[PDB]
Ligand binder design. Structure first.
Ligand SMILES: [Cl-]
Lengths: 247, 247
């Protein structure tokens, strides 16, 4: 018997996931690949900090397109442009380096490791619900990641299918509609209250997944829920159990 | 394991994508049964198989209206509910004296079909080394509904309504490969219909024939063997899986 949302009054039929941070540990993976690049190419970097500088270009690089100032391109292109960007700020010229080797680095985001609860939790949720990402990633990045890591999604509606980024209302609404589901039949699971806010504002069920070290041991934000989401959870294993109790 | 290189495209295959109705699931028995059940619950009389085969007759014609430019694209769901009305009329029934919502339920019977027995295990084995999903005229929500009721283990579902194209419109194939980040030559079309495989060969995709001699029952005339020089000709999806591993 599915979980009926208190906030939205409908029976959940899809639990879709924010992917970076919520499902996979982006930072460990980005720092890793950066450290490997750094050693191989004789650079002198704080790999961890470099990953943090590369992530901090994510929203601004998306902000340009959200506002209409730039025409939609895929997260893979943004990620690549932001890497150049972060190199130069670190005082390294890109074309001093091989372009295809830097694309490879840029696709490190395709190759990310789940949190230890992710695959087991998602495996259990898949038995009772449609699962899939609800993510700024484009379809091919998300799919590469799902295949590499064995993330068992049923469906992949990438941002490049809606031609929209979160938190643009149409990110949520269009996903719900291509899946054949009223917004309120669709729960968004996310480690980020902001994303949950915007999900709620569209009329989606919400679930908060605490992720205290997404950003390292000195993380500041999203350390608890700042909203009355349907579910608050310590991981996706907890999400599955709470989905099963009902409302 | 070492990937299957298409002789026709020369490229290593990375995605094996499937025509679904017929190639993977036995639509005919599925629709026959559902009709017979609606028939009996609303006290009418009909050759439920025949009605099924007429409902199927209205598939390509309902699409050709969109393929020619003569009509604005819509979801196969909408098309199927319209053709239901059509076939009812042909069978002497007037749709206005039935509950709209009950007919909307009958039209979504294409979402509840049974895989051929060889399908789920064959796909499971291919999933372990390749991307798998449909390449089909079904819309996403329909095909997802189907995957969920029957455990068809797709990695990704690019429905016809994502490409806003219907097969064999060469764009249908090309937008699928694109959205997956793959060169057309890296995608294989597995189909039990030679005219779909020909449309996809001519667009540059790799090819697999799967023999389904009873898709239209014992009195099936069509597609009772491979008419092209396809990469793979198979007896079933499990055979396809084995040939893929063979190389
Ligand atoms: Cl995301």
């Amino acid at each position: 018997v599915p979980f009926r949302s208190p906030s939205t009054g409908r029976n959940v039929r899809a639990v879709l996931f924010d992917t970076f941070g919520t499902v996979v540990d982006w930072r460990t993976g980005i720092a890793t690949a950066v450290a490997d690049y750094a050693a191989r190419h004789q650079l002198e970097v704080d790999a961890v900090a470099f990953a943090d500088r590369w992530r901090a270009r994510y929203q601004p690089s998306m902000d340009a397109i959200l506002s209409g100032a730039r025409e939609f391109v895929t997260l893979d292109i943004l990620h690549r442009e932001n890497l150049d960007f972060v190199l130069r700020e670190s005082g390294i010229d890109p074309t001093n380096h091989d372009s295809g080797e830097l694309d490879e680095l840029a696709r490190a985001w395709h190759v990310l490791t789940p949190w230890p609860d992710s695959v087991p939790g998602l495996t259990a949720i898949k038995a009772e619900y449609i699962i899939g990402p609800l993510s700024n990633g484009n379809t091919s990045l998300l799919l590469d990641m799902a295949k590499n890591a064995g993330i068992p999604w049923d469906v992949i509606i990438g941002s490049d299918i809606n031609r929209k980024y979160k938190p643009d209302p149409q990110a949520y609404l269009r996903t719900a509609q291509v899946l054949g589901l009223h917004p309120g039949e669709v729960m968004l699971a996310a480690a980020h209250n902001g994303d949950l806010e915007a999900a709620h504002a569209t009329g989606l069920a919400t679930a908060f997944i605490l992720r205290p070290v997404e950003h390292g041991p000195h993380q500041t934000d999203d350390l608890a829920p700042t909203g009355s989401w349907d579910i608050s959870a310590t991981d996706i294993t907890d999400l599955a159990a709470q989905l099963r109790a009902g409302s």
